[PDB]
Design a protein around this ligand. Structure first.
Ligand SMILES: *[C@@H]1O[C@H](CO)[C@@H](O[C@@H]2O[C@H](CO)[C@@H](O[C@@H]3O[C@H](CO[C@H]4O[C@H](CO)[C@@H](O)[C@H](O)[C@@H]4O)[C@@H](O)[C@H](O[C@H]4O[C@H](CO)[C@@H](O)[C@H](O)[C@@H]4O)[C@@H]3O)[C@H](O)[C@H]2NC(C)=O)[C@H](O)[C@H]1NC(C)=O
Ligand SMILES: *[C@@H]1O[C@H](CO)[C@@H](O[C@@H]2O[C@H](CO)[C@@H](O[C@@H]3O[C@H](CO[C@H]4O[C@H](CO)[C@@H](O)[C@H](O)[C@@H]4O)[C@@H](O)[C@H](O)[C@@H]3O)[C@H](O)[C@H]2NC(C)=O)[C@H](O)[C@H]1NC(C)=O
Ligand SMILES: *[C@@H]1O[C@H](CO)[C@@H](O[C@@H]2O[C@H](CO)[C@@H](O)[C@H](O)[C@H]2NC(C)=O)[C@H](O)[C@H]1NC(C)=O
Ligand code: NAG
Ligand code: NAG
Ligand code: NAG
Ligand code: NAG
Ligand code: NAG
Ligand code: NAG
Length: 751
């Protein structure tokens, strides 16, 4: 299957064929295909010729064509009347391709030049459930405003989703179809919303009016405010008939007042986005809060008053009325202290599991207040000013197809929250953890203390008040490991991340003690990456009866092993239950044979990539019966073993990309399902016949003489072995040949 990778399932077959440098649509496309993917190519012409009696095709993706306009022939797709989804994004169009099929349910024309939405190109469409027209006249192109001729949509009676964001409309278009469920109009330069704007949209569940009269604060053009920094103006009766509304986005509309009356007839509102407005007032005395007993997510982030740095956050009593609230986002309100009384209104909300107070520059917090909550699972306090526990103004400056407006990535890694209540204190000033640092905290399972300039010597008492932490993140600090009892008070610890604490490890004379590792009975994952460890004090071996994974990259094994009295010859041996080991980025030029033999026999996965090894004693693989993955990418390897099977019976994956292998020997030979030989120095592959699902080869300098026949043969016979990127497997020589994919070859002249 070339050049498109025909993948199968589920209950339909698709031809993955994008980003292959195509100038055209291959005709040689397996019949009876559900849909085709042709995004990210150089195609420039779409025509009747283009799709011939495909018939079967339901979906077509032609986005990003070409990667520098796109020419399309009227009625080009009509030959396909089973076409339901058509994607034409980033194709630089200046009009809605005329003559479009009526079988379309979904049509995307995002990121194009279309400034006129018309009945000729649209109204026929009829079966459209989803229509996307975002990013066409987003000043400038140049483009004054988007023009929608009156009634273009009313004939689309099955229209469930209409997206017109990032287009200058000035006014909401009339004659909208009552079937609408989602209406996106973010950044449409609409300043006034009238009573009649959404008159008959009785089925709306989502309305996005964000970025209209934005609060540009600390941003330049294309961010453009309404004259005099005025907020969007919404009529009192603008939403009286939108009783099905679940999601309302009013982020960055420069609102100062929220009219409670807008919500009288909106009992189902689950999500309300009010980020990037000027609502500190409303937050203190907002009547609109009494109208939302069913709200689950309220985002009030970045509503700070420039230059204001109040002592306390002023949260209205009415917050107590948001009985269905599950998450409250209060980033960037900016205040100095959080007292138990300040959060009174929220202590009764039964479903509140997430409180986000990131970026508030809070100096003090009465932590006992968190114990008075029914369901907190996530306490996000990153980027605050908590100090070790023994003003009047401030200068805070803030600086797709995607959004919601809140960094949709989770607040805490999921591998961490999964264990329980999570507390994030990263990016604070806990440069030293005091004796009462964590007093009065609920039972925390997940804790992040990353990036706090902490240079202390942990001694075994710092976490006595929260001894049930399972996942502890101590990355990016300058901890001084000079006490064997460090962290032993966390008997339940399962994941410990000490990455990026190189500062004391680098200094000669300072002592380093990692003995605490063995004291944990349930420790599973330990990451000591990027610590430049090159010596240990007194106790030279890491040991754990439980540890399963050890990430030791970015340290200095070259020094620990490559020199010495064999002090660290058995450094990892005592990791009796280890299955994964990362030794990348350790500047290894040579591994002592006994050093390698002492790695735990229990290993199933070993990474040694990105070192500088030139030889590898394969024979050593004999002592690793359970070894399934072996990674050696990014080295300087020269030769391969001639008898691989006399050493391994379990190896399944072998990664050797970015090496200096120039000759693949006889064989091999095997449980080996994956082999990566991409980016090496293979001029050609000698016959080497024969159970493997994948073989990577792009990047080698192949010699395209008739010798490329044995191999060329090989592939033809085995379409059962995936060769990702055949397109990139290229001829290095000879010169007429060079640059040509080893399959494009006009072999015939070979006779
Ligand atoms: C210190 O060292 C530790 C340990 O290695 C690092 O933490 C690990 O980080 C790795 C890499 O981020 C994590 O692996 C990732 O896990 C994600 C979540 O997995 C869960 O959910 C999936 C399905 O979503 C299940 O399959 C799975 O069993 C888990 O329940 C995955 O989503 C990630 O995606 C992977 O697969 C996709 C396939 O599409 C690929 O696109 C990705 O590239 C990737 O291969 C990935 O598997 C691992 O969870 C971490 N361990 C822990 C305990 O957190 C630290 O980050 C490191 N510290 C620093 C600073 O580097
Ligand atoms: C204003 O707030 C709005 C209310 O939340 C925001 O609306 C959201 O906008 C985002 C981005 O445009 C949409 O997210 C996308 O959704 C599609 C659809 O995926 C569907 O299928 C997947 C299966 O994989 C499923 O998991 C989803 O739940 C969907 O059913 C995705 O394909 C995209 O990758 C992306 O996630 C939201 O869907 C949309 N919310 C809703 C409820 O429709 C809006 O973005 C905000 N405005 C701005 C300017 O930020
Ligand atoms: C602890 O918080 C830190 C800081 O926010 C997180 O580290 C960042 O992680 C993100 C995404 O993984 C990266 O884009 C940043 O570069 C990281 N910054 C720093 C300072 O390291 C970290 O992921 C958090 N840890 C957990 C377990 O949630
Ligand atoms: C819109 O709201 C007004 C308010 O009186 C009401 O009279 C009208 O019936 C509503 N329209 C629809 C279609 O529900
Ligand atoms: C504890 O929570 C309840 C609300 O559930 C509240 O009445 C009480 O005042 C809180 N305790 C303190 C000390 O704030
Ligand atoms: C909210 O909390 C109540 C009481 O703990 C629980 O019964 C309910 O299921 C929770 N709501 C959701 C949506 O999980
Ligand atoms: C570790 O720290 C504890 C508390 O400071 C201390 O009592 C002990 O002497 C230190 N040294 C060792 C090796 O445990
Ligand atoms: C940790 O293990 C070492 C060596 O077995 C032992 O000396 C020490 O008492 C242990 N520490 C704790 C807190 O259990
Ligand atoms: C070995 O690792 C496995 C997998 O996490 C774990 O279940 C087992 O308890 C570990 N062994 C010991 C001795 O803790």
């Amino acid at each position: 299957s070339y050049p498109c990778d025909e993948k199968k399932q589920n209950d339909s077959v698709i031809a993955e064929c994008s980003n292959r440098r195509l100038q055209e649509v291959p005709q040689t496309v397996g019949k009876y295909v559900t849909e085709l993917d042709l995004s990210d190519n150089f195609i420039t012409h779409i025509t009747n010729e283009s799709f011939q009696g495909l018939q079967n095709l339901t979906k077509i993706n032609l986005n990003h064509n070409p990667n520098v306009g796109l020419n399309i022939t009227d009625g080009a797709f009509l030959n396909l009347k089973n076409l339901r989804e058509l994607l034409l994004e980033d194709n630089q169009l200046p009009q809605i391709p005329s003559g479009l099929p009526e079988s379309l349910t979904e049509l995307s024309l995002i990121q194009n030049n279309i400034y006129n939405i018309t009945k000729e190109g649209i109204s026929r469409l009829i079966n459209l459930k989803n229509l996307y027209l975002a990013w066409n006249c987003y000043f400038n192109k140049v483009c004054e405003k988007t023009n929608i001729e009156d009634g273009v949509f009313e004939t689309l009676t099955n229209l469930e989703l209409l997206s017109l964001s990032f287009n200058s409309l000035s006014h909401v278009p009339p004659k909208l179809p009552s079937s609408l469920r989602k209406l996106f109009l973010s950044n449409t330069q609409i300043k006034y919303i009238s009573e009649e704007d959404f008159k008959g949209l009785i089925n709306l569940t989502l309305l996005d009016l964000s970025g209209n009269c934005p609060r540009c604060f600390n941003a330049p053009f294309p961010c453009v405010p309404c004259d005099g920094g005025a907020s969007i103006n919404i009529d009192r009766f603008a939403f009286q008939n939108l009783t099905q509304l679940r999601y309302l986005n009013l982020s960055s509309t420069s609102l100062r007042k929220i009219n409670a009356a807008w919500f009288k007839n909106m009992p189902h509102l689950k999500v309300l986005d009010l980020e990037f407005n000027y609502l500190v007032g409303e937050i203190a005395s907002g009547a609109f809060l009494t109208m939302l007993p069913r709200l689950e997510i309220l985002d009030l982030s970045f509503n700070y008053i420039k230059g204001s740095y109040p002592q306390h956050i002023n949260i209205s009593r009415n917050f107590s009325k948001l009985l269905s609230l599950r998450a409250l986002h209060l980033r960037g309100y900016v205040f100095q202290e959080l007292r138990e009384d300040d959060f009174q209104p929220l202590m009764q909300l039964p479903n509140l599991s997430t409180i986000n107070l990131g970026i508030n520059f809070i100096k003090q917090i009465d932590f006992k207040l968190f114990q008075n909550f029914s369901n907190l699972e996530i306490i996000y306090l990153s980027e605050n000013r908590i100090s070790p526990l023994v003003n009047s103004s401030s200068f805070q400056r803030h600086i797709p197809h995607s959004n919601f407006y809140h960094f949709t990535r989770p607040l805490i890694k999921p591998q961490c929250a999964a264990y329980g209540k999570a507390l994030d204190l990263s990016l604070n000033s806990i440069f030293f953890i005091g004796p009462n640092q964590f007093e009065n905290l609920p039972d925390i399972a997940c804790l992040n203390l990353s990036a706090n300039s902490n240079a202390q010597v942990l001694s075994g008492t710092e976490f006595s008040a929260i001894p049930h932490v399972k996942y502890l993140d101590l990355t990016n600090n300058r901890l001084d490991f000079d006490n064997a009892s460090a962290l032993t008070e966390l008997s339940d610890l399962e994941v410990l991340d000490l990455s990026y604490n190189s500062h004391y490890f680098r200094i000669a004379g300072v002592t380093h003690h990692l003995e605490f590792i063995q004291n944990f009975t349930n420790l599973k994952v330990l990451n000591l990456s990027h610590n430049n460890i090159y010596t240990l004090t007194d106790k030279y071996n890491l040991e754990s009866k439980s540890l399963v994974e050890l990430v030791f990259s970015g340290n200095r094994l070259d020094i620990l092993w490559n020199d010495d009295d064999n002090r660290y010859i058995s450094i990892f041996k005592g990791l009796k239950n280890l299955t994964r080991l990362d030794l990348s980025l350790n500047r290894l030029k040579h591994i002592p044979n006994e050093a390698f033999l002492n790695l735990p026999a229990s290993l199933t996965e070993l990474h040694i990539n990105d070192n500088m090894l030139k030889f590898f004693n394969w024979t050593l693989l004999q002592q690793f019966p359970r070894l399934e993955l072996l990674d050696l990418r990014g080295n300087k390897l020269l030769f391969l073993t001639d008898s691989l099977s006399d050493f391994t019976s379990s190896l399944r994956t072998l990664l050797l990309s970015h090496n200096r292998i120039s000759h693949l020997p006889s064989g091999f030979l095997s449980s080996l399902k994956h082999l990566d030989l991409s980016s090496n120095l293979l001029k050609t592959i000698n016959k080497s016949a024969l159970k493997l699902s994948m073989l990577e080869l792009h990047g080698n300098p192949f010699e395209c003489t008739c010798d490329i026949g044995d191999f060329r043969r090989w592939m033809d016979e085995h379409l059962n072995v995936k060769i990702p990127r055949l397109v990139d497997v290229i001829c290095a020589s000879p010169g007429d040949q060079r640059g040509k994919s080893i399959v494009s070859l006009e072999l015939t002249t070979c006779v």
